[PDB]
Paper text:
The tripartite motif (TRIM) proteins form one of the largest subfamilies of RING-type E3 ubiquitin ligases, comprising more than 80 members. About two-thirds of human TRIM proteins feature a PRYSPRY domain, also known as the B30.2 domain, in their C-terminal region. All characterized family members shared the same overall PRYSPRY twisted β-sandwich fold consisting of a 7-stranded and a 6-stranded antiparallel β-sheet.
As observed with MID2, the crystal structure of TRIM10 also provided insights into the conformational equilibrium of the loops lining the putative substrate-binding pocket. An arginine at the center of the pocket, Arg406 on β-strand 6, is positioned in such a way that its guanidinium group is poised for both electrostatic and cation-π interactions with potential substrates or small-molecule ligands. This central arginine is flanked by several hydrophobic residues, including a tryptophan (Trp471 at the C terminus of β-strand 12) and the above-mentioned Phe411. Due to the generally shallow nature of the PRYSPRY substrate-binding pockets, small conformational changes at the periphery can significantly affect the results from common druggability predictors or pocket size calculations. Some feature an arginine facing the central region of the pocket, though contributed by different structural segments (e.g. MID1, MID2, or TRIM10), indicating a potential interaction with side-chain carboxylates or C-terminal peptides as observed for the TRIM7-2C complex.
Residue numbers in the entry: 305 to 481
The structure:
Amino acid sequence: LDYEPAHISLDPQTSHPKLLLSEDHQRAQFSYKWQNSPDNPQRFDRATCVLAHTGITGGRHTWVVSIDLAHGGSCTVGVVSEDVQRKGELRLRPEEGVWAVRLAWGFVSALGSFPTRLTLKEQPRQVRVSLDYEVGWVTFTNAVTREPIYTFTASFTRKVIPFFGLWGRGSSFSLSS
């Protein structure tokens, strides 16, 4: 509970063409249109994902993702090693530097080679990500109720970057701390 609220801004260099970022870089929604997004090496081309601008190399840090799934979409939240594969079919799993949870209506899972289905007391509106770089914890909780969701144990050898994904029109997320 000594996790330091962090500023997150979504990096428009990284965002899949199917994600629309807000002017303030605090929100994203799944867009009906592929944008004519410059295909620079930092940009996801298949995974409908976006990174934060600023990575973490130490300490304890925490941020909150508010999730709105209007019509059976999904949202993915977590952290990636900064050398995560961005081009092609990415497998979201620890082995490939992804520590993330996927939320849909009636469906939450921790992503790995062997995804873990999680049944919660409530459908999370808000997911708190609490990262302890020093120990190697990625903790997910319901940011309103503090209900535990999942904890990954990780060995960080590189910078880690807050990670977000959306699938399906009417799906969106917004950031706070």
